[PDB]
Design a protein around this ligand. Sequence first.
Ligand SMILES: Nc1ncnc2c1ncn2[C@@H]1O[C@H](COP(=O)(O)OP(=O)(O)O)[C@@H](O)[C@H]1O
Ligand SMILES: Nc1ncnc2c1ncn2[C@@H]1O[C@H](COP(=O)(O)OP(=O)(O)O)[C@@H](O)[C@H]1O
Ligand SMILES: Nc1ncnc2c1ncn2[C@@H]1O[C@H](COP(=O)(O)OP(=O)(O)O)[C@@H](O)[C@H]1O
Ligand SMILES: Nc1ncnc2c1ncn2[C@@H]1O[C@H](COP(=O)(O)OP(=O)(O)O)[C@@H](O)[C@H]1O
Lengths: 445, 436, 51, 435, 443
Amino acid sequence: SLSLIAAHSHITGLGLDENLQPRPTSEGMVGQLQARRAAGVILKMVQNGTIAGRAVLVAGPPSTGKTALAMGVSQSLGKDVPFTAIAGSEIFSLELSKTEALTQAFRKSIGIKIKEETELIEGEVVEIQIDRSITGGHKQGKLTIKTTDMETIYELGNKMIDGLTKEKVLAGDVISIDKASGKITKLGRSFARSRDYDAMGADTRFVQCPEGELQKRKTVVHTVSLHEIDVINSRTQGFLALFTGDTGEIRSEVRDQINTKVAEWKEEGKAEIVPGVLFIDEVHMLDIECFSFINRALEDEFAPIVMMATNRGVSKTRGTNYKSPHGLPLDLLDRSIIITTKSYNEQEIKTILSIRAQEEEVELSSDALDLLTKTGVETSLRYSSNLISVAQQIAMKRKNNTVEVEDVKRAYLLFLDSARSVKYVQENESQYIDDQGNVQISIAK
Amino acid sequence: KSLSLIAAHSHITGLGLDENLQPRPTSEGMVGQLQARRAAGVILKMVQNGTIAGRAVLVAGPPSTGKTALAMGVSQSLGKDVPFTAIAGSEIFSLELSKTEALTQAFRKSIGIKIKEETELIEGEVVEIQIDRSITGGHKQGKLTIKTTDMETIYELGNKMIDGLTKEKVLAGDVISIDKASGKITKLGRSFARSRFVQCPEGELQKRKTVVHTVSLHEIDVINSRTQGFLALFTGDTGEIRSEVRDQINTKVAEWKEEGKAEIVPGVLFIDEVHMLDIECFSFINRALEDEFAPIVMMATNRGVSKTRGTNYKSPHGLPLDLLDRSIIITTKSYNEQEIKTILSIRAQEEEVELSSDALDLLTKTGVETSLRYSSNLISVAQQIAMKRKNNTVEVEDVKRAYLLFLDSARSVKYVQENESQYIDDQGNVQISIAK
Amino acid sequence: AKKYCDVTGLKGFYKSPTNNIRYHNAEIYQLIVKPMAPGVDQEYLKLRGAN
Amino acid sequence: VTRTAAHTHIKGLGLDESGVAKRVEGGFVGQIEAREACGVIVDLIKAKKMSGRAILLAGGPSTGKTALALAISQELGPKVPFCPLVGSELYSVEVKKTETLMENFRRAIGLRIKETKEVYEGEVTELTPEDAKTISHVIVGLKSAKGTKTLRLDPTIYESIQREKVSIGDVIYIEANTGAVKRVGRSDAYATEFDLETEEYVPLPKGEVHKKKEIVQDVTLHDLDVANARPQGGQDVISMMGQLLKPKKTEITEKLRQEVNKVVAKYIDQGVAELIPGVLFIDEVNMLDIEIFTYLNKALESNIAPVVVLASNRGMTTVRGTEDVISPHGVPPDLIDRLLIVRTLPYDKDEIRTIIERRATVERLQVESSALDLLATMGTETSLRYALQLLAPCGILAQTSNRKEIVVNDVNEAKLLFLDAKRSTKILETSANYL
Amino acid sequence: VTRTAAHTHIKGLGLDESGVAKRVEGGFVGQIEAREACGVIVDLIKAKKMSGRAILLAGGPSTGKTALALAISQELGPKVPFCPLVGSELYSVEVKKTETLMENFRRAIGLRIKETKEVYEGEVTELTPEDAENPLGGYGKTISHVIVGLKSAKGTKTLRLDPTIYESIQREKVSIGDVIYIEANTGAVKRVGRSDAYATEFDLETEEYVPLPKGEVHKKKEIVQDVTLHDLDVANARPQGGQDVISMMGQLLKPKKTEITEKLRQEVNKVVAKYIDQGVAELIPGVLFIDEVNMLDIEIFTYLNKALESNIAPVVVLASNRGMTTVRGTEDVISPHGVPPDLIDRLLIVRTLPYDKDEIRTIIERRATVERLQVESSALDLLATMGTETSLRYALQLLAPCGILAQTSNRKEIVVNDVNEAKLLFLDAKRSTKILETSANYL
Ligand SMILES: Nc1ncnc2c1ncn2[C@@H]1O[C@H](COP(=O)(O)OP(=O)(O)O)[C@@H](O)[C@H]1O
Ligand SMILES: Nc1ncnc2c1ncn2[C@@H]1O[C@H](COP(=O)(O)OP(=O)(O)O)[C@@H](O)[C@H]1O
Ligand SMILES: Nc1ncnc2c1ncn2[C@@H]1O[C@H](COP(=O)(O)OP(=O)(O)O)[C@@H](O)[C@H]1O
Ligand SMILES: Nc1ncnc2c1ncn2[C@@H]1O[C@H](COP(=O)(O)OP(=O)(O)O)[C@@H](O)[C@H]1O
């Protein structure tokens, strides 16, 4: 929960009914009824989990709500479903190929669900004794574990003994031992022994002594993506590559082995497959090789549902020398269904600006909101959305709690949009460095 | 100290200037370019004052007319314990470093940190060494009789000093230097005794001397970086030192400067042939000259309205106009016959080549008619013709023999243009057959 | 115990090997410690009882 | 004494309590509207509520965009993080440019940690271990000039002490919270056990044995990301040599960033840590690639993205990485929808003269009144930066002739010796052989 | 009998004591002025007083530029370091071309070092380690010392060894009865082999049986070494040779080319200057030869412009066969020989002239003499006319198929019919090009 007020933090799910019918303004989403209904259909396709490898293109003009629709789909999906939102330029790597980055993004968006039982015995040890036998081949021990309420004695096997010799226990530190799994961890020393040793050290930490029942039962559900299994089985200590990203072109034989073992676990009942969405924001910034691999990797059984967003017209495909619709080749557009987003009118711009003002805790007047709506009709919507939050700071600088028309006018004067800046550049083109590198620095001749 | 015999700029011992920053016509191996030498003396005083940072200096002119000579004069008149990084334009195109990172390392190699510290040293001639050992060698007794020319003393040595004396074997008559703290014992050699050789030290034995260190900011950057140790100053695999280490080093240097623990010694970064950089490097130079710990950057170029690298347009000196906005430009001029004759006389007396008057006049004529560097290179290659016929002084016909043996640019271009079929053109067409 | 110069009572860094007398610096050694009469050293050392 | 490098007369935006810019305040001359806009931006940063707020300030070269960015960084103080960046720095040969952009994004989000420094120091007069071959507790009695102090110790500190070969009489350093052990050296009481000895001897510290201190740890999110994603492994506190395998930058995954954000939020909810969002300032943005420009669109919509400030001196220029996308300031239109543009105006003769006088005052130079208008005329005729950079040769040519005043002859001499870009290009055009 | 490959018929420039070239001496035919210029350059290198003197060999294909450079290398001798190079060899995928050029610059400067070595050698008689009181203390080695008994011819010795010396003792698998060689300079230990005083025929390892080393066990021997500055640079950059941890791990890692810093090169120059100052080292500058110099791009050309003004740079010899060709990496500049004019201004161009018919004929005759093939006068005249008609190299490389065709007919001489059949079997560039124009499918 380290979130400030983002670009679209007001959107909590698509505002749909039980019949996949969009409400006009609910769950932070205003308008775009056909796009929201199609996004609800795609969300039901994801939640069904039986259709795999479908490509969806969310196409429209800039500042319309394509990535807003993707954020709504991600928020309406809920937790424990793998959603991977990447930009189009994230796959041009130096340590990975474009195909390897593509398939790593593909396998990050489909996962398995594992349910396991934990019989946790978490407590502070009272005393542990080492029974060094004369033979030395076998060691037995009695573990005096305690909480703030009860204290029990546990007989201890030899594997417990040399697993507690490692991560060594010093009679008063909080540990937690599983019964069936046999996992050991050392959470740290108790707060009762905080003033015992006069200096902490490096590898120690102070934790509270646990309370209540000593032996606790908890079912914990793990959602593991296929990319996690790939990175783990790609090496001997693979989690360092999982958190540093130094996987380095995992070979396809371990991917086929992992797919076979995942199908074996699904048929056996050890885990169940949880598919998700891979959202490639700004998909027009991809090479034609990445496009062909996207076409031919969507036909795999373990493929997620790919949502693509673009705002390009009939633009040039990257890596080629011809133009194409949406910046995508026609074979990729053949295997896709296009959701189109329409431009807004005055009422929808007013409602979006009001919702964005409420999300930023900014209070506006009625005529100030009318001026902001007129600015968002003439200029773009994002310009007025930023003008709201800078007119708020003007209002607090003026010792006022509400944003009036004068604050919006001052913010309009201070901060320029695209059209005013391009007109002011074209009027004084000699003062700027042009494409030929010529500029007039001096103000007089 | 650090000897190398003859170089191209070895005759230059600095800018020849008086106390009033006016250039003598012939001083310190530098003749001509009086306005350029005066401007370079002004830049040298800008460096020597040390109160002004991040100034771009551009040295522009025709090729082979006093550009790198001016930088070598600035570096020679700068004096030691002041950093002078001399890099080229093509030196920053690394395979394990970015261009901005290599430029940052070249910038920070030219700012020195002046630190004075006191140390204790014991230096003298060993008279007698007496270690008594046991069977196991755990406990040992020692007696070190050491002397200088003024003193004699005897020391009882602990076990660690006995171990450090048996290691790096010291005998009687050796002259050694001992650091009491680190325990390093350096054998300076043997004393003057017939029955390599170093004079016996004089005066005190336990000496307190002040050593003076000048460590560049790049060295502290490498050492403070926890990924690689100090050996990356020699191996060169520093590998993109992060900016937080740079900020910590800047704050610690600003801390040491206020408490008097250290001094700032700014230097000169000389980027020879600066036209080889791209527009990204030029903009990083533009934003890297507005920093506190930035040296005074001297750039040299001979390009005139050339294409900027990484762009598609033409710019003066190969540099964009925003970089030229931040630079003050020193212009070097071409030489007349007397300046060329004086340069040839200096280069001949540098290489120990005795010239006649007629050979000097011929060299001056072919210098003002072909190139200065051609006549500079003809001297050393005509001296071998002079000693090949057992003659000391280089005569006129030795210079004529070297002229007909070795071609300049114009004669080679004319010979290529007359025989264009014998050479490979742009289209890869050649004729090897001498018939037809 | 701290070692002091036998001539002046200063901090005695060195000690002459012939007459076994600790001294402070080079000037003291050249002036007093080296050109001294026999028997003077045995009563210099009598102060700290090292005779 | 002091070093001035094209700045350091800029002490701030020079505004009043109402956010109105005076004509001359804080070393700023003119530029009222952009200074007021930057003050509004500074208030928005100090509100610490919004994320991903991007502004771009554009204008002609030598008009004060970097001066305004440094004034913003001065007005925010040294507590708020500020990451100055050039657009060429994002192109790294070790890692991709989007990872470098994300690293510079997370370098501009800081944390404030209230931590306690506790130090035990002094001569060791008692070092007695207690076993049960396993040491149970360690009794250490330190000694300083103000008295002694006897401490228990866990066996880990004896492991560090035996690493440091600490014996009786060695003046050592012990940090209570972190367990760092440093051996300063032996004391002067044991400096006469041998006449010559390899050990170094430090005096008894005159302070107390137990010293307590409250200090403030200012870290960033990128520092925690680097410290949690070392590819080879951790290193000790004292290590003069690097690891034998070269550690290069790696594409840090989103999982590590999510876990770091979770741990930082958990420490914030306990009140231990305070989140200070800051400014990422990318200068000369017009040479960003279209890949970096496209990834900036996604990175600006993050929940923890800082306030991004861009500067460009281009007009109708092609975006780098494209071939026909003509866009204002070299910035693509889909990004330019996401920022607010602050126009930076050129100066007139009086403002140029006032800037010249301010820079001459901050460089400790006395300029005559007649030379100042000539320098202003040269600034209006060639460039402001040419007139600003000629003050130092003018001062040295004045000091050469034993004076503390800039006479008009010295300005004429400095104009004759050093040339601007216009006269250099005039020489370049009217010459035959490479200049 | 021997192996000859396009060369080795040239043993030198073929000059007298006055520097005047003869016509046919040293396997060289013609090129009097070029050979005299190369002899003057050879005298300049032998003067050992210059730095950065760069010449350029200009001429057409098959005119003798690489032959002249190899003749310079043969005339200077094996003591002068010669570094032949190709312009495309500077493009490396491990390090930048700047570093490769500077490495080849440092590889051409060598020096003769008179190095003294402290040597403990002999037959191992005893090997008794001394254990420590606490081996599991965490810090400190397991053993304290190792007593080594060494016996040589007329003398014996016992040595109490440091554990770090014992690591290098054990790593070469030293046992009792082995002749060893301990070098005290680096701590390196060489196991010479099993001693021959005991039995020999009872081993299963093909070991070397070595007699007792003469003289004392402890020795000081002076060894004359020949190293270059680049060898010292890569020794200090990748440190192997010590007994410390970094030296042992330096031998096991994959060797990679690194950017050698200017600080390391200046420190190496300072130590080498000190070694010269004591008189145990003598500096021998050499030749760096970069054949096909037209294939350098403008970056390496600009760094060559910078590095020719260094005070330690060797004598550089360049060769090209381009007339007016654009420099690689650039678009518009037309320059002679593919070399930019800023580098041309620091050069001394030596022109190499083409050959006549008689020079081609005696070149064919001398190459047939070196290849040990007998040719008659009519076949030699046919080969001369053939060489003037097509090229010199095509007549040069048709000598061996002519000898093969003569050997298949059980004859020793080469006749007109052998040259005719080698002409019919094998084609030159011009006839194959004429085949290429007159074809429908692309040939
Ligand atoms: N239907 C909508 N409901 C609520 N907010 C919207 C809607 N459409 C767009 N927005 C808001 O407009 C801003 C910019 O729209 P965005 O989704 O970035 O456009 P695009 O998808 O073309 O990039 C976002 O912050 C988003 O929250
Ligand atoms: N004023 C001078 N005094 C002595 N030598 C000079 C002078 N000017 C130029 N030279 C000589 O001219 C040669 C070319 O140097 P320079 O012109 O400074 O570099 P560049 O050729 O890169 O412009 C040098 O070898 C130098 O010896
Ligand atoms: N209003 C001002 N007051 C004082 N100095 C200024 C003012 N505006 C600009 N300057 C100076 O002019 C120079 C402009 O350079 P800079 O801001 O780095 O480039 P740009 O203006 O192109 O962004 C700075 O060194 C700054 O010190
Ligand atoms: N003057 C000469 N005398 C004898 N043989 C020569 C002479 N010139 C060239 N050759 C031979 O002709 C061949 C020419 O090849 P080479 O010299 O390598 O090419 P280039 O002439 O382009 O440098 C060489 O094998 C050499 O043996």
